[PDB]
Amino acid sequence: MRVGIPTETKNNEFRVAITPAGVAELTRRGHEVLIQAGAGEGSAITDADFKAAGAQLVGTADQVWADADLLLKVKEPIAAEYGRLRHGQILFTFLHLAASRACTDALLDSGTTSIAYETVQTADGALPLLAPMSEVAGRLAAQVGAYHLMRTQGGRGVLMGGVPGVEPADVVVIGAGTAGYNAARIANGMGATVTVLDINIDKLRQLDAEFCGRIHTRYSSAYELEGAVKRADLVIGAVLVPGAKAPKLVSNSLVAHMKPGAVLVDIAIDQGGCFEGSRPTTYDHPTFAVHDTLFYCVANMPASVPKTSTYALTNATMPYVLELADHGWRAACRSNPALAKGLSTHEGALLSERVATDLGVPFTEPASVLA
Amino acid sequence: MRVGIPTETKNNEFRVAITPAGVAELTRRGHEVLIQAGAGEGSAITDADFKAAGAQLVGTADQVWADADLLLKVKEPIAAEYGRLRHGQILFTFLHLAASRACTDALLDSGTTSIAYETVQTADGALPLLAPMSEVAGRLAAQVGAYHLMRTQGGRGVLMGGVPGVEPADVVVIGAGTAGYNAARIANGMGATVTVLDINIDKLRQLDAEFCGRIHTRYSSAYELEGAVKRADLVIGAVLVPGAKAPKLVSNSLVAHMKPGAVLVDIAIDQGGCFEGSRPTTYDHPTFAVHDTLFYCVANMPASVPKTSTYALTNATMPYVLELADHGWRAACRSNPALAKGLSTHEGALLSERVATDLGVPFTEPASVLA
Amino acid sequence: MRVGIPTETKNNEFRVAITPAGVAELTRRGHEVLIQAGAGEGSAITDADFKAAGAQLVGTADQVWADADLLLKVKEPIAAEYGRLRHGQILFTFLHLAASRACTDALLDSGTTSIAYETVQTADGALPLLAPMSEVAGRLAAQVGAYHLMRTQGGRGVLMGGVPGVEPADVVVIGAGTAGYNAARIANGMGATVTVLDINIDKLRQLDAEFCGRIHTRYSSAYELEGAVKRADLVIGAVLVPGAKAPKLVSNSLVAHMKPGAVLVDIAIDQGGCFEGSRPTTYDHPTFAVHDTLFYCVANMPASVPKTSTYALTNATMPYVLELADHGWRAACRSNPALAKGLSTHEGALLSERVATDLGVPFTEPASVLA
Amino acid sequence: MRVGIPTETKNNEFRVAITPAGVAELTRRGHEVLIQAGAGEGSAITDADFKAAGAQLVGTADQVWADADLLLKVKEPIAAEYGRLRHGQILFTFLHLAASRACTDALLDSGTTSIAYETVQTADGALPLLAPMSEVAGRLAAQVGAYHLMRTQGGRGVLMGGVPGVEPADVVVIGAGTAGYNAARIANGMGATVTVLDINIDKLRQLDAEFCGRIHTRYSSAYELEGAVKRADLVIGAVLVPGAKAPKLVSNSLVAHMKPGAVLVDIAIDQGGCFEGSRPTTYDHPTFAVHDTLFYCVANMPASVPKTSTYALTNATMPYVLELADHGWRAACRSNPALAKGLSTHEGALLSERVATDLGVPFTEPASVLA
């Protein structure tokens, strides 16, 4: 089939959904690979690199979208792309539909078949395509939080690790999953005192063992959470219920009681944000004031480190890309339950129960479109 | 005597040279403490906090300077302050004279008595007043280097620590002293691959043992230095010869051979810079381009984390401040050889041999003005 | 000469001042070794073990004391032993004279020559005979503090290390020297959050590097000390000025503000105690109440682990014992400045300036009795 | 329904089965919470704290027991409570029935419905309600073992971690599960040389990886076990077969060959003890002599650290408490197989096969009382 990769268009989005190695393997398998001129430049993959791997370089986005049987992207379609969505095409990308009625409607109205990276899910419950991006975003949260704690950025003016004889920053991570663990690990490595909260005690045990208690763990009761947040210099929101809109765990009322110049990084912004005061920001304007604190709410954090994140992502997605190209969506999803869990839309039907619930929109069973 | 502390005026300088506790101890000893209204605000020390500790709050900088027998500052006098320097007054602050003929001339022409924090030196050869700032600056270099490696900042677009299956950043630290050790430690904590060079093998042996080889050490031969720099995503320049202009270790020719978007942080900029291409930048405009790389050359790095660095600095300086106030410069320096090594100017005479050599200016023996 | 070792008589004192190996080395050098029957039993060294090494086992303490030219002990003479002190005899033991006018007077009135283990001091300033006992006492403070934190012991009822999801104990160590470092290390190993204070920043810098920030370090300002103590579940007092009465750093007023059931272990009790409320306790009755807290003030902590501490002590003391036996006190002290610093009394003259100052008693120069 | 929490009555039992937060959530759900006056005081939860959360404070235990539909406790009913057990009430607490015919009979004769915390078991085989108490007891075993190794407690007189140049204690842990891992981790953190035995090699691999071999692992053959025990200063028994009486792994004959003053802590005492010589002790009298060793056999170890263990326990139990209150035992157990595995008695029927086998008492299938 024809596999198309357009240039990402979200603000400062430097990632691309395929590398030369993936192009070469698709072509080895009898597929036609179409790629918009310039699509890999953010990730230092020249048109010439893609050409040598076997891609057809096309001048415009409209052609990639029109010609592709399988359209591969990194981020969700944005408003200017809603018109490019079409019936009879497979879209494979991060979707975050529980967080956007407008995006969901556009997919449904177009009749396109869409599969979300972030709801592809193996039998152990893991999300193998979200995981590498959660790892990137977690590590970035720590480095971005430390930078914004500087007085010159409007922060409290506290050094992450302190220096001998002087207290370090107090960092609170909400969620001990992939992003939270990665945020905690880097923040701890920068010398901050790190506390991680979760409602899953198993995850806290795992963190306790891995750092031998150097990273503090607190069960996420209302009392522990509020107490930790009030004391924090930096809060990193990293909770998830797979495919769902993030729960609102930190109220604006709580934020009003925080130390002046504290920083809050809402990693969960891609699913709507786990802070009440969150709204999406971009790399051009990443922060805004809430009460006397600074919120950071970038829904495409890994975009700033494309040399790392393009590869991390495609190492994970490629086996799934190959099965979709070889067999088409129905046969691929039929053969792979994990893949099938990423199914989101098809011919105006919404195939995710959690998305349908969060948006208040009718749900149709995926088994129905697969049988 | 009268101990005066004016507001710092260098760009984005949020530190202050004393805290309420130091003010209280000075007043307990019969000293008059004069402080410019607003001087502690960058460090979250209000005029009211200084007042309660015993300070006289004065409206203008000119008064502090005119009235103080001992003038305490954080950074060197800048141009607009040259007219405030006076004969009969002791100035105790960071000076960096080997890096500024203009500052040195101003001190000499004023006839003031000046002692440099950074050349106060104990008999083991350590610089106890520079050390905590070198600790701050080293830790900041890692976090600031990581941030500027982001594509959105003009950098290469590589995450410090990578993620599983994908390479981390390659970090090179030149100098294994206080600043370099701290930069290496934080960069390593962020998951970067860190290589540290020095000409002092003892210092490399210490780093090797502390991290049991996780931080790489290379003797600083031309071959090792050039090779490490060409491979680096981030270079941190942290060399020092006490009180001297920094040696130029990284040529612009070498920089032309580096990877595009690499970042170079010149911590040694306060002493003139150890990179050939270095020139001082400010927190307002911290970076500039050299060839295809980004240089970061801020001479007052600890200013951005004043809640940490004001205290770190004053924990160290205060015992020296108390000796100078109790006994005056001559008797304090007679009693304390370490203090006496900080002696820089007195009545138009330049008292540092290393500074005199570097600037091409007459040297006068400090034992002569202490006899 | 005759080297005598009596049985220790302080409460629960299970240590002994020599082992079979030391006895054998003394006898190899032509010395007569006299040991009280039963002296080694606390340390599991039977009379038969000492006999086989060459010792003369004697039935009574009075004989050991009467016959010995060099008398080796572990702890200071107590009241019932004051009548055994004699002119012409060398006493070599822990003395702690700055803490006991009564002990000092007894030594002075007897005219005996005494050398204190704890003031023997090498040119680097280290106290090589105190050090291994400080190591023992520091490690014990952590384990004894943890035990007394149990509700069943009157303490707050908090587990040292917490468990995943639940806060650990907050431990504050005052003094970053041998005892404090060892207390911090063990407390941290038990999973407590440990903060260590000192006025010597060099020592904090060393702790910071050794644990890469896992043990918190705070410069010991009034503000940091008071704040840390109010938050603490367990406080360990481990400060020292060599040969001096301990400074009083924790007021009873501060103790009144602590959490109910907090535990305070005063390791510095042997030198008078660094807590205002401290008074010496014994292993039989180790604790007492101050306000709503529990104080632990045992002046012979290493006695409880004699299998460890007898050997640790004698590994260190023996080379000094051999010098004193071979050459006598005057020539040994003439040859070894470190040994000479332990000189405490001789023929009614007090030879330590620090002790003399603390007790308000005339000082006589040790160079005078060595000339 | 009515949820009742009486004061614990076992010796020195300071835990309570609910906290204010749990009370508040039960009341939010339409349940009536009854709590005996004083029940939370051991855990520093005042009657006023429980009152503010919504509980009815009742004067006597008899009323709590009579009125409660769901009775929540920490420990098993003791003799003086056997008369309070009633038909038509759900009891949810630690039971340890395989270790007490008398307790089992009382439950059976009363006709009450009982569910054991310690046999609630998820599909991975884990025991999520036992786990936090195993974590507490393991960590306590190390600290309690170290204390009793002191000569002043009748132990060998060896310091847990030794000091430089002198050997540390030799610690042997039997069982590499939750309690054993926690005991090993703390003992290692105190500087002891730790060896852990198990028949499950997977658990030994996990320990080997987590400490990179610093904690020794030995397959639990008769040879390795006997050899390790004879060499040990401290033995910690931490084996379990879920719901079963502990196997007797250390014979009195073996104990006769141990070093004099060795300490044995039998954590498995709650299930009957894994040492042949074990019998339950209390916090009032925790130890007794076997041959020349000291046995410690406290069946309610976490009771001494209630500020830690009350919260650890209730963080785990609460989701199960809520389901029992909302739906009653039959529907809750029907919906939750893990919960259903804790089913122990109902109307005179014993529902645990392992308990019935160990006691030699008839077994009835749980599916029979659930269908």
Ligand SMILES: NC(=O)C1=CN([C@@H]2O[C@H](COP(=O)(O)OP(=O)(O)OC[C@H]3O[C@@H](n4cnc5c(N)ncnc54)[C@H](O)[C@@H]3O)[C@@H](O)[C@H]2O)C=CC1
């Ligand atoms: N902003 C960005 O650019 C990126 C955002 N993300 C987002 O980061 C978030 C976290 O992702 P992962 O770490 O991979 O998820 P994960 O599933 O590995 O971890 C989520 C954790 O949150 C915990 N949790 C859920 N509800 C909670 C509550 N009410 N209180 C406390 N803890 C709670 C869960 O128990 C779980 O341990 C997701 O929204 C993900 O989409 C991921 C990559 C990039």
Ligand SMILES: NC(=O)C1=CN([C@@H]2O[C@H](COP(=O)(O)OP(=O)(O)OC[C@H]3O[C@@H](n4cnc5c(N)ncnc54)[C@H](O)[C@@H]3O)[C@@H](O)[C@H]2O)C=CC1
């Ligand atoms: N930009 C800023 O705001 C601040 C800058 N600094 C500066 O950082 C610099 C480093 O200071 P510290 O780490 O405290 O000094 P340090 O004396 O502790 O270490 C300097 C190291 O550089 C090494 N070195 C000297 N010449 C060398 C050569 N040719 N090649 C390789 N290594 C060489 C030395 O052997 C020494 O180990 C100084 O200029 C200091 O003033 C310090 C604080 C703040």
Ligand SMILES: NC(=O)C1=CN([C@@H]2O[C@H](COP(=O)(O)OP(=O)(O)OC[C@H]3O[C@@H](n4cnc5c(N)ncnc54)[C@H](O)[C@@H]3O)[C@@H](O)[C@H]2O)C=CC1
């Ligand atoms: N109770 C017992 O059985 C034993 C008690 N000790 C005692 O433990 C105490 C500590 O001994 P080491 O650790 O060997 O001494 P050390 O000399 O190694 O360390 C003492 C530390 O206290 C610090 N210090 C002094 N004054 C201070 C102040 N005002 N505030 C904060 N820190 C201050 C010093 O800077 C130094 O780092 C001594 O009194 C020693 O005799 C030692 C062994 C056994």
Ligand SMILES: NC(=O)C1=CN([C@@H]2O[C@H](COP(=O)(O)OP(=O)(O)OC[C@H]3O[C@@H](n4cnc5c(N)ncnc54)[C@H](O)[C@@H]3O)[C@@H](O)[C@H]2O)C=CC1
């Ligand atoms: N005394 C007290 O206050 C408390 C006692 N406990 C008890 O501690 C004991 C251990 O609990 P957990 O660590 O949670 O259990 P677990 O199931 O996590 O670990 C038990 C380990 O024992 C091993 N084992 C079983 N039979 C063995 C044999 N014959 N030889 C060698 N190893 C063997 C298993 O393979 C397993 O790894 C249980 O009896 C538990 O009820 C728990 C909490 C408090």
